[PDB]
Each structure stands twice: as structure tokens, then as C-alpha cells.
Write an enzyme that holds these catalytic residues in place. Structure first.
Site, short mmCIF file in Angstrom:
data_model
loop_
_atom_site.label_atom_id
_atom_site.label_comp_id
_atom_site.label_asym_id
_atom_site.label_seq_id
_atom_site.Cartn_x
_atom_site.Cartn_y
_atom_site.Cartn_z
N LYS A 95 -8.68 44.11 36.66
CA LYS A 95 -7.88 42.95 37.10
C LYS A 95 -7.45 43.06 38.56
CE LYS A 95 -8.08 40.65 33.08
NZ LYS A 95 -9.06 39.52 32.87
N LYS A 123 -16.53 32.63 26.19
CA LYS A 123 -15.48 32.98 25.23
C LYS A 123 -15.50 31.99 24.08
CE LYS A 123 -12.34 35.47 28.35
NZ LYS A 123 -13.47 35.81 29.25
MG MG Z 1 -12.28 36.39 32.72
#
Ligand code: MG
Ligand code: MG
Lengths: 363, 373, 374, 374
Positions: A154, A260
């Protein structure tokens, strides 16, 4: 084969290590099959979706598909589209349950109904949360020791926190101890300005093997960065519909996509989008927003039937929450997992763990 | 002058130097060759070879070559073999594509044309360019140290160019292995050498970009055939600073036009039997030369018969655009013909004999599998 | 579930009616079909057809189809016929291209899989879209008046779509003749009809632009396959306001991606044996539909076996994107199989029997030219 | 085989019927021709012509052609006339550009090469394409009514293709006149005809766009050489729906590449002595053909010697891309050579004699102005 009853459940999934608001759907047929599907948005600011919204959309979607044949995935999809535009989060739970049924009726695991099992386990992604460069590096080291090969790292520092320099240092640190056969993805979660991303790119040392994911909040910003970025680019938040992928191809916008299950809208659009991406030569990370074993089952079966040279890991959602909503025989071993061979999703759902249904349609 | 008889031969060419590997787990142990002879009313014989690189290189295989010849050979019987454009038109009118099959017939016709004119083929295709043609090795996939040692052996033989086959799976080490293969293969580099990193259409754009990022700065390398499709190649082109050569994606003349329109590449891998023989090699040479694209003059693979076509074409190619000729003698142990073209004075020189300059060993070819006329 | 035996049949398909004419002096009188049966260990039989349209439509010919099958058929022995993507990968790993040969094997596997699931193929491929599929006529090259009259026969027979063949040489009358052919074919149109001007990759850009200039204003016409190459088609596209549909130039999934990237066309002629069977038809339908490209669902040519595959696929295609199915039975005299799908009330409807719904006349195919396996 | 002697001849070619006006007040009353013979050690003589169309068509003039030959001719002595690419290279290495001067030498070498092989040139350049080559009718700048009448005269003689000159100054009537000329020339249109409006690099983009707007709809017309520069032509191309053919702007092989890269045109005016001889005509034909560009095969102007080169090249050009050959014999009264290729019914066929098929009248050429000689 007819859909006869749909149960909508709400259940809290506590974070492993706040919580996530899950919607779990069961669909029953006249022949006595039960299919299961999950949709749980990652909070309410990942994309334009939230749990209350998922359930509010299901109020329209569930009654509309009653009496349909759950094997006719495109016609069920059309019925949902004709009922309510968007809300693919709500479509996902119903769509997954119908595919679960369909695979059961065909006597196949879902991975064998969606093209066929690709040999060997699916590599599972390691997730490295935002922290100091040295802390992230140690977490990568811990995950390395456990057998993980692929890492999602991240990035997205405010100027006050250290900005592009901090994100550049985070990337260099995470890669510092790398061993052969590893893969790294810097995920900005649609959070960088183009100016920030360009400064960050300039600050990176040369010779890094890194993929950049979801750099910017909008299509136009992402297109501007694309023109001046030599790194492979993966889009996540910006890719929800099949038309989104066509636009990306038209604009030559990216070299990969973060698919996703509940963002794309269930098995049906995951398959359409995999076909588009594969044709375009785009690499695919196969994940979901977040979820229980039920969500994990959909992820794993789809990942298992994806060509390995395009696949860039699957997400094991069981690592994200403490929830125990179902059993599935797919243990995480050596940084990988294998879809089970039971017909359908291969779930044994603990119905009691879900609480009494918030809503029932049919009888 | 009239074509009277066409004979189709089939034979096996054993690999020289161990299993040959390409990207995506492709392996080659021997090659199935199709050799054609064409006879005229005046008693001249011309020879042509077409040997696909297995069935997994482009949309062609040896069985397909022979199946296509069943239509193509009878179609050109009675024609004047010197009329290259009209024979080509006849073949096109008979069967679309199948340039692998056109190739063997087209080369045999040019062999006849050159013999009739009493000229070596290089002096029928523009004229001999002075000095030998530099030759290029075909370095099949292996570990970096295995590949580097193959480069060294070819270096000691007088080879100046090297085509190095890359394209590692993620499991094998991915872009980092390929970058290691490239660096290892260049490590012992001597002056006046030239390197192609050939991925044989086997990389994703993501893998290529990662590989590009991993390469050390200051390398003199040309990237070849990085991706499987036109659209992927364009995407990489937009974000690749290295010179790019296309191979598998360039088969027809119209392919080269599309490449120019898209500004897709800086050179072309012209393979005699992929392009479809002498006639299209010359057309594609004219297009590439006008566009300033460098040209590696090769074939898929072959015997001395393939090598004669390659050599004579390379010999008449402007030297500043030429990037080596493939010496296929290093790729197989077959001895289907003699050609007086030894490696010396910096490479290989086309013979001065009329035609291709071959003395064909019929005893090495087997009895013909089909005859037309 | 295991594939145990594959039979390759070669059979002649006599043409129905008169000489068939395409651009560039291409004439056709009969068709060389290859028909494949696939048997499983459980006693299911699936069927598939691949019949190249002669040897000059695309880079494919019947002898080539059969030569390719010599490699493909033995490679898929022992595989589970239900795992369409893994069988597809096996075929790709065995031989690049040759989608004509992949098609017959791929279709037979889908026939088996749909039978094993207890579903007609249209219900296994997304689900039956309501009502009959409109069928397209195939109006071969002739004088304008003769074309117009051929449009009439088909109109009376319940056809709403027409594929009209264009591509005159300069000697024949060039772009003017093609423009006249178009205006004449549309002259008697009734509401709800649809016209494709198919040049079969045979116009120069200069010819196409001249023709476009010569057409009267206010026509409802779609231009199909104007030019022989990608670069030529791109050049025409820049200066053409008519919807463009690509046929010969779209064979692979990657071709379709390139068309999208180049914004090259507004539709695609999807031909079962050109794209390579049910598997790539589904992939290419997903891509086309996502891009909002209209699709004409056809095949090169064939018997009832080809028609079965065409019809089931067309039947599960969203009606707003569909631009007719080709009825191959109008093009051949062959009686290779029974299928219950006649032209009535708007077009043809896929039968409801599990699989392709074929009853194959096994003596009409001849003894297998080749068998693999058991 | 060795080149032994090169003779340079100069001769005037008097205009035949209608003194040409090109755009921008350009006028021409006779043509200054350069004719070269090349001799070999085996006693073969080849012939080649280069005669610039005055001094304002492109960057060439007869005096310049001869001044360049002072460098080029001695440079190729001792070379094998059959090695066309290597002679070309020698010429390029000797003097950049000056393709007008290269042409005469190059054509003569090909004449020798052909005779040595005992083949007419059309058979040394790919092979004779069956049937006569259509010959273009040339319609000089005049009133719409006069031009129309001249098209009708050529129509009655059997000509099918017409090149019609446009490019009126504002004072003369501007775009309105050019549009009226075009409209008139096509008014009596019969099937199978072709029209090329040649502006000779003479229009501003503003003028061209105004002319295009003024043209009535539905015309079958090709626009040639609209503008003086590459950049102007690009701008017009962005806003022009008519097929575009470039002439003056295409001289080298790299020019054709630039045209492809910019998608600038749909055709090319190939002129033997503009392109630089047989060798570059062949290279440029290969490029243009691969791009699907139509090709008009012509020369600047010339005698029978120029015509021999034109005809043989046109004869081996694929017929679907060919847009007529120019009969230069119609442009002058000069009788420099005999060639058995009569104009009949708007067409001509290359002869079968080895080489160019010329029988040159040496007395009509004058004593050579220069011999090499070194
Ligand atoms: Mg992502
Ligand atoms: Mg002109």
C-alpha cells in the site's frame, strides 16, 4: 429447474488483527438445490457501494429473478439489468448463488464449469499495509518466510507524511530483500495526484521490478499519468463494467486489471471480463472486496480456471476477517491454495452463523 | 519455357546441438522438411525448401505445407517459371495464405530463372553486394550460463550476430531470468557484433515492461517479437525505448504496410518461407528498405537448400540495412546438398554458380511423396 | 468423463440452385465438408462441422482442415469434453491457428457437454432469448435487376435481413455498378428489414470511396468487409460515415481487440468455423457485446450440423445486437442430419432437445477417412 | 556483360494539338528531350528517355538532366547492366536526387537486360497481364462546355478514362469554374468510365474546400495533386471525402512511405522519369500495391522511347490497381522510334520483341552532344 426461494442475510465480519458488513444470499430451487453467494463492500469509500445499499438493491433484484432457471446466467443477468441499473454489488450475491446451483446440477466444481482446472495451486497474494518503510519490509520478510511470493503493497502518503519520497522509500524497502520468483504490486487505491505519482516515479531507483495499481481517482487523471509512466499499470477501482474494459483498451490505458468478484458483479461478469482481458493480454489479479469463506470460494474457483501466465495471485479473504460462516477444503499451504473438487462452490455453510434472514422472497 | 514436372519430397532434419527451446515451453528435437524440385520442358531443374518451425511457431505445419501443395503444384503446371508475379497471382487465386507452400514452388522457379539466365540468384535479385555476409546464430532457451557458452562457440566459428531466445514463465523466474539471460549472453561481447533478444511472441506487456525496467543501462540490444498480438505490440511500442523488430507478426506485404502506418517497429525478421519465397522476400525488402527498417534475412529453419535462398537474398541486400544472414547449417545435421559457401573473411559469400548454386544429394531426400504433371 | 474416440468424415455438399458469385471473379459450385464425431466413455456422441468456403475466402481449405485434424484430434484424446478452455489450450499448444480444424472438435465437445448437463446448447450458452432468430438471405453477384428479384424470393419466404454481394471490376462497371446493385436491392424494402453490402474484402479504398460518393443520400445500409487488409480498412474508416462490419479480418479474439483499439468497425460477421467453434464464438461475443458491436451470426457454409451451431448461438445472443443468423440449409442440398428448426413466424428457433439437437444420418457421411483412439 | 559506351542525345519534341496550361499560369510549346543509348561489350544497345515537362512541373529541367548525366554516365561505365540495384546504388553514391537523369540510364540498362534474356520488358518485370492496357484521355483546361465536348470525342474513339485539368485563379472564376468543369466533364457519363481531376499541385486548401462544397452530390471523381506541399495536402485530406491521388509529391520510395504513415492518399501518379526509371517504378509499384493504392502509369512527356517504358510497366501491373497508361505519342509529333503497339479502342498492348521493342531512328536524334568516354 426453477428458483423458488431467496433468503437475504446480514452478518458482521470482525477484522482479523473495525468490522465488515456482509450480505449473504441463499437461493433454493424446486429440485431442492441450495446455492450461496456473498457480497460485502469494503466499507463505503472503496467504490460507490455500501452494505445498506446492497440490501436495498436486493429488494428489487431478488423478486425479479424468482421462477427463473438459475442455469441461464445471461438471461438472469439481463433480468437484473432491466430491473436496476448498476448496483453490481447486489447482482453479485444472486449471480454467485445461481452459478453454485448450476455447477451442482452439472456435477462439477465451479472451476471445472468455468473452463477447467489449471494444474497446480493458485498463488495467494500477501497484503502489506501502509506503514514505515522498515516495518513494511519486515512484514514482507515475515510473509516471505511463510511461502508467499506475490505482495500487494500500500502506498499513498500525504505531503505532511512525507509524500512521494515516502512512497518511493516504501517501495524500495519492500523490494530490498527480494528472492527469485517474487512479484510486487504498489496499490495506491485511486489516491495519488498525477503530480504526486510523477514525482514518486522520478524518486524510484532504477532497475526495480514493480507493477503500479490504481494510481489516480479518475479516468482522465489515469490517462495523463499513463502518457508519462513506463511502469506496467493495473486498474482496479476504475474497472467495474465490461464497457469499462473496452474504454481501457480504446485508450491503451493499462496492462492489467484487478478483478474483484463483487465489484465486477458476480461469476457472470468475472467471466466476460476475464475473456476481454485475456484477449487484450492483460494480467489479472483475482480477488474480492472482502468477505468470508463464501466469498473466498468464488475467488478461488475463478482463479483456478484462469490461465496461469495471466494470473497475478488470488486473495484469501479468510485472512481479512475472523468470520466462520462456512467450511471449505482449501487450506492455505506454501503461499498457495487449490479449489476443492466437490460439485459447485464446495461450501458447507453454517446457516445458523448467519443470523435469521433479514428478508425472504418466495416461500 | 514451361514447367513440366513437380516433385514433392519429405525428410527429417535432426537438430544440431541439443534440444531447441522457445518461450511458452516449446521444444524442438528435429524438423519435418518439404523439398520441391521443378522441371522444365528444356530440361532444367530448380529446387526449393519449406520447413515450418514445428507447428507452434506461426500458423503453419509440415503436413499443412504438403496439403496446400496438392492445390498449388497442379495450378502452376504449364506456366513460364520466369514470370514470378504471374505465378504468384496464380497461387493466390488458387489458395489464400499458405505462404509456406508457395515458398518451395516460388524458390524452385527462381532457381530455374537464374539458371536459364546463367546468373547466381544474387545477380538476379539486384546484384552482389561486395564482401561476405555476416552470419547469425540461433541460441535456443536455457540457463544464462548455458546460453552464454553457446554464444561463445558460435563466436569461435566466425558468427557476428546472435539471436537469443527469451521468455521465462513466472515459475521459472520471469522477467528477471530473461534479463539475466540477456546480460549473460552479452557478457563476452567483441567489437562489431549484434544481438537480438527474441521472445517469439511470448511475453505479456506487463512481463516485457518489467523486463525492460530490470535491464542494466547502456546495453546494445534489439528486442524481437515481444508479444503475441498486434494490439499488445502497439501497447509496448508506446512505452519501449529499445529498437523493436517484428517477426511472426510480419508475414504478408500488407503486414509491413500496417507496421509502417502504426510506426510499430524499426526492423523486420524476414524468413524466406514465412514471407513465401523469393518473390515476396523481394517485395518486402523493397518496402522495408524504403521505410529504413533493418532486416535480418533468415528462414524458419532448414538444410543447405534453405540456406542457398537465405544467402543469395542476403548477398543482394544493402549492407547498411542487413542484420546478418541465418546459417542454418548450424541448426541441423542434415546434408541434403553441397554449397560452396564456407565461413571465412567475416561470414559467408554467395557462390558464383548459376541458380542457387546447389548440388542436391537426392540420396538424402528419400523417394518423392507426390509427383504432378 | 473422457473423450475415447474421434471420427473424421469427409463428405461432398452439392450447392442448392445456381452458380454463386463473389467479388474478384470467384465462382462456387459445390462444398467439401469435414464432419467430426466425438464419443465418450459414457456413451455420448457429439457432432461438429467445418466446411471452408472454397479455398480463397480466408486462409483455409478442406484438405488443410483435415491435415490439421491429424495433429489436433489425437492431442485431445482422454480429455474431459466439458473443460472447453483447457481443451482449447491443448489445441493451441499443438498447432497455431487452423481455427477451421479446431471448430469441428470444439463444437462436438460442446454438443457432448450440453447433453451431459441436460440442456439445449442455447440454454448452456447464456439461455434462450425469447422468440425466433431472424434469418439472413445470401444474395450472390448478378445484375441489379436479378439481385432485386432474388431479394423478393427471400422476402416472400419470411426473410428480413439480406446480405448483398458487391465488388465489380472496372470492366464490369466498377463502383457505379456496385452503387446500382445496392439501390436496386433496397428499392422494394418494407419496414423492419436490414441490408448488408458484402464486398468480401475485395474493394480498393479508391473504389469504395467512389462507390460511397455514387450512392444516393438517405439509404439504410451497412458496409461489410470492404477491403483486403487492416491498413486499407483503417484508411477507408477515416472517410466513411456508414456503419462498417468486419468479417474476414476478424478471426481471433486478439483481432477484435485490435479493431476496438483502432475504433475500426461497428459490427462483426461471426462465422462459427472462422472463429474456431463454440468456445471462441462465446469469447468474441463477450468482447463484441461489451464494445456494443452488432453481430451477424453465420458460418462459412455447411449442412444441418453447421446450422445447429449457428442457430443455438444466435438464440442466446441479445436481440438488440444480433443481425440475423445464416440458414445454411438454403445453400446446400446435403441431408447429413435432422434438426427440428424450420423457418416460421419471424425466423428459426433453436430446438429444445439436449445438445445441438441433431439426429445425424451416419450413412450419409461415408465411412470415416480417419479414426483416433478406440 | 559490361557497359562500354554511353551516348547522350538532345532533341526537340514539338507539341501535338493543344498547347498545355497547368495551374498558376504555366505554359509549354515544345519539349526538350534527352535520349541516351548504352552499348555493351557483347554488342547490345539499350535506349532510354528523360524529358521533363518544362521546368515548372517538378524540380527538373532538360539542361539539368544533361548536367547530371555528366556525373552519372561515366560512373556506371564498366558495370554489368543487369545488376539494377547495384547500378542504382552507384548512381545514388554519385549524385543525390536528380532522378530525371537516373531514368534515362536506368531504362537503357533494363532494355539491355531484357534483350540479353530474350524477353520483352513486360515479361522481365513480373509477366504480361492479359489484355490491352487502357490508355488515358487528356482533357486540357478550357470552358466546361469545351472540355465536355472533348470528353465526348474521346468517348466516341473508345477511351474510358479521362484526366481533366483544373486550377483556376480567382480572376478566372476560381473554385466555381473548377466545379463547373468537373460537372460538365461527367455529364454524359456512360458505364465503365473513370475520371481524374488533376490540379497539378495548384490549389490552396481554401480553394480546394470551396470547390468540393460547390460540386453537386453523386459524382464519380478522383482528385489528383491538389496542393503544393505535404502539409497543405495533409490538411485537405482531413476534410476531403474524395479519393486522393498524389503525383508531384511522390518522387522517391521514402515519399510513398511518408504517404502511408500519414494515410495521405488512395492512389499515386507514377511517372517513369519522375520516379527515376524502371528500377524505382518497380519498387514503388511494390509499395503502392501492398498499400492497395491505385496507380496511373505515365511519364512527364516523351516520344515513343518514353512510351515503350510506360507501356511495358503498365502491361505487367495488376489490372485492379492500374488506372490507365499515358500514350505520350499523342503529346508530340516527334518520330524518334518505331514501336508495334497501335492505339486501338482506347487501349494498347506491349509488343513481344525482346527488350523495349523499339526500332530507333538515329537520324532523328542528331549527333550525340556527349559520349562517354569517362
Ligand atoms: Mg486494488
Ligand atoms: Mg498529374
Amino acid at each position: 429447474l426453477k428458483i423458488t426461494r431467496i433468503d437475504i442475510h446480514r452478518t458482521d465480519l470482525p477484522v482479523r488483527g473495525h468490522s465488515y458488513d456482509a450480505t449473504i444470499v441463499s437461493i433454493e430451487t424446486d429440485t431442492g438445490l441450495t446455492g450461496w453467494g456473498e457480497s460485502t463492500p469494503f466499507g463505503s469509500t472503496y467504490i460507490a457501494a455500501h452494505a445498506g445499499g446492497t440490501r436495498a438493491a436486493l429488494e428489487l433484484l431478488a423478486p425479479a429473478i424468482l421462477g427463473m432457471d438459475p442455469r441461464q446466467h445471461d438471461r438472469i443477468w439481463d433480468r437484473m439489468r432491466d430491473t436496476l441499473k448498476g448496483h453490481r454489488d447486489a447482482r453479485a450475491a444472486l449471480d454467485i448463488a445461481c452459478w453454485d446451483i448450476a455447477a451442482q446440477a452439472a456435477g462439477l466444481p465451479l472451476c471445472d464449469m468455468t473452463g477447467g482446472r489449471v494444474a497446480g495451486p493458485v498463488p495467494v497474494i500477501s497484503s502489506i499495509g501502509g506503514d514505515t518503510p522498515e516495518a513494511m519490509r519486515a512484514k514482507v520478510a515475515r510473509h516471505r518466510a511463510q511461502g508467499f511470493k506475490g505482495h500487494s503493497i500500500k502506498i499513498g502518503a500525504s505531503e505532511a507524511e512525507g509524500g512521494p519520497a515516502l512512497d518511493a522509500e516504501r517501495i524500495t524497502a519492500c523490494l530490498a530483500d527480494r528472492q527469485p520468483g517474487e512479484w510486487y504490486l504498489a496499490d495506491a487505491n485511486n489516491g495519488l495526484t498525477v503530480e504526486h505519482a510523477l514525482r514518486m516515479l522520478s524518486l524510484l531507483p532504477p532497475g526495480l521490478d514493480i507493477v503500479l495499481e490504481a494510481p489516480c481517482a479518475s479516468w482522465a487523471e489515469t490517462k495523463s499519468l499513463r502518457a508519462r509512466c513506463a511502469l506496467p499499470l493495473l486498474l482496479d477501482e476504475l474497472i467495474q463494467t465490461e464497457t469499462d474494459l473496452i474504454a481501457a483498451i480504446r485508450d491503451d490505458l493499462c496492462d492489467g486489471v484487478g478483478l474483484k468478484v463483487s465489484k465486477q458483479g458476480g461469476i457472470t461478469p468475472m467471466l466476460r471480463q476475464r475473456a476481454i482481458a485475456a484477449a487484450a493480454g492483460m494480467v489479472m489479479s483475482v480477488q474480492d472486496t472482502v468477505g468470508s469463506q463464501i466469498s473466498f470460494a468464488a475467488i478461488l474457483h475463478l482463479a483456478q480456471s484462469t490461465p496461469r501466465h495471466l494470473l497475478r495471485c488470488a486473495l484469501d479473504t479468510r485472512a481479512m476477517t475472523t468470520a466462520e460462516l462456512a467450511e471449505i477444503d482449501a487450506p492455505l499451504r506454501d503461499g498457495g491454495a487449490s479449489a476443492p473438487s466437490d460439485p459447485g462452490l464446495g461450501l458447507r455453510v453454517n446457516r445458523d452463523a448467519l443470523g435469521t434472514p433479514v428478508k425472504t422472497f418466495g416461500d
